[PDB]
């Protein structure tokens, strides 16, 4: 009887809407430390502490191009961050401490009793995600701090793609006609490198650097795996093991590979 299992069981077509279970709620983050500026989704009555998951835009992006994923995810029991950088031209180093940064403030709000998600978040369950130099970003915070339970970075760009220290279950989302973090020289030798934990590449077939963002063509199959990944991952949660672990077989996905999923 596993302790962090929230919500009803998993179906595919409850994982492919474009909402979960749980009602939603936000708010601004009044006082953002450490980083620009933060959004708080989180569910109502999940049924017990939830993990939380800070996630970050890449280079001149804001909180709009990765938005879609607080309530997809907040909606399957997750208090979700998303976030601003202090200047839209901040590189994945220090996004990565912004990232941090996001999630100890749901930490320290976890415990202040004027807080809507007072007493909601398991404060030892934590996840990142982000695009780009974002996604980047949460390559960097995982390899920096592996008591993190899960990542799912999305067309993630650093300078350096030798991330073998990461011990973190890890999620690549890739897009197959990327121009800007070409898959050949960013995402996929990324995902090769990763040598020490549970792994995942899910590219999007003809899709352009932005094909995870907002607005999205693939939500139903790309919510249902970021979903599904945390759930796995940051919940134990092997109701969960199919869906995060299995081939798609879908003409969404150019290419697909996994390692150590259990």
Same mark, same amino acid.
């Given at each position: 009887?596993?302790?962090?299992?929230?919500?009803?069981?998993?179906?595919?077509?409850?994982?492919?809407?474009?909402?979960?279970?749980?009602?939603?709620?936000?708010?601004?983050?009044?006082?953002?430390?450490?980083?620009?500026?933060?959004?708080?989704?989180?569910?109502?009555?999940?049924?017990?502490?939830?993990?939380?998951?800070?996630?970050?835009?890449?280079?001149?992006?804001?909180?709009?191009?990765?938005?879609?994923?607080?309530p997809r995810?907040?909606?399957?029991?997750?208090?979700?961050?998303?976030?601003?950088?202090?200047?839209?031209?901040?590189?994945?180093?220090?996004?990565?401490?912004?990232?941090?940064?996001?999630?100890?403030?749901?930490?320290?709000?976890?415990?202040?009793?004027?807080?809507?998600?007072?007493?909601?978040?398991?404060? %030892?369950?934590?996840?990142?995600?982000?695009?780009?130099?974002?996604?980047?970003?949460?390559?960097?915070?995982?390899?920096?701090?592996?008591?993190?339970?899960?990542?799912?970075?999305?067309?993630?760009?650093?300078?350096?793609?030798?991330?073998?220290?990461?011990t973190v279950?890890?999620?690549?989302?890739?897009?197959?006609?990327?121009?800007?973090?070409?898959?050949?020289?960013?995402?996929?030798?990324?995902?090769?490198?990763?040598?020490?934990?549970?792994?995942?590449?899910?590219?999007?077939?003809?899709?352009?650097?932005?094909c995870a963002?907002?607005?999205?063509? =693939?939500? %139903?199959?790309?919510?249902?795996?970021?979903?599904?990944?945390?759930?796995?991952?940051?919940?134990?949660?092997?109701?969960?093991?199919?869906?995060?672990?299995?081939?798609?077989?879908?003409?969404?996905?150019?290419?697909?590979?996994?390692? =150590?999923?259990?």
């Open positions: 009887t596993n302790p962090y299992a929230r919500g009803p069981n998993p179906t595919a077509a409850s994982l492919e809407a474009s909402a979960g279970p749980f009602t939603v709620r936000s708010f601004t983050v009044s006082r953002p430390s450490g980083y620009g500026a933060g959004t708080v989704y989180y569910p109502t009555n999940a049924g017990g502490t939830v993990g939380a998951i800070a996630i970050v835009p890449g280079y001149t992006a804001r909180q709009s191009s990765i938005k879609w994923w607080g995810l907040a909606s399957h029991g997750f208090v979700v961050i998303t976030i601003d950088t202090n200047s839209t031209l901040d590189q994945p180093s220090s996004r990565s401490s912004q990232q941090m940064a996001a999630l100890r403030q749901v930490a320290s709000l976890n415990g202040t009793s004027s807080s809507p998600i007072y007493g909601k978040v398991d404060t %030892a369950r934590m996840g990142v995600m982000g695009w780009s130099m974002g996604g980047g970003g949460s390559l960097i915070s995982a390899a920096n701090n592996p008591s993190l339970k899960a990542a799912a970075p999305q067309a993630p760009w650093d300078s350096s793609t030798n991330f073998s220290s990461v279950p890890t999620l690549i989302f890739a897009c197959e006609n990327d121009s800007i973090a070409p898959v050949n020289s960013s995402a996929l030798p990324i995902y090769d490198s990763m040598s020490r934990n549970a792994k995942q590449f899910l590219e999007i077939n003809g899709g352009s650097h932005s963002n907002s607005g999205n063509s =693939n939500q %139903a199959l790309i919510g249902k795996k970021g979903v599904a990944w945390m759930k796995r991952f940051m919940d134990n949660d092997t109701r969960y093991s199919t869906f995060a672990c299995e081939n798609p077989n879908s003409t969404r996905v150019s290419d697909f590979r996994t390692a =150590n999923c259990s």
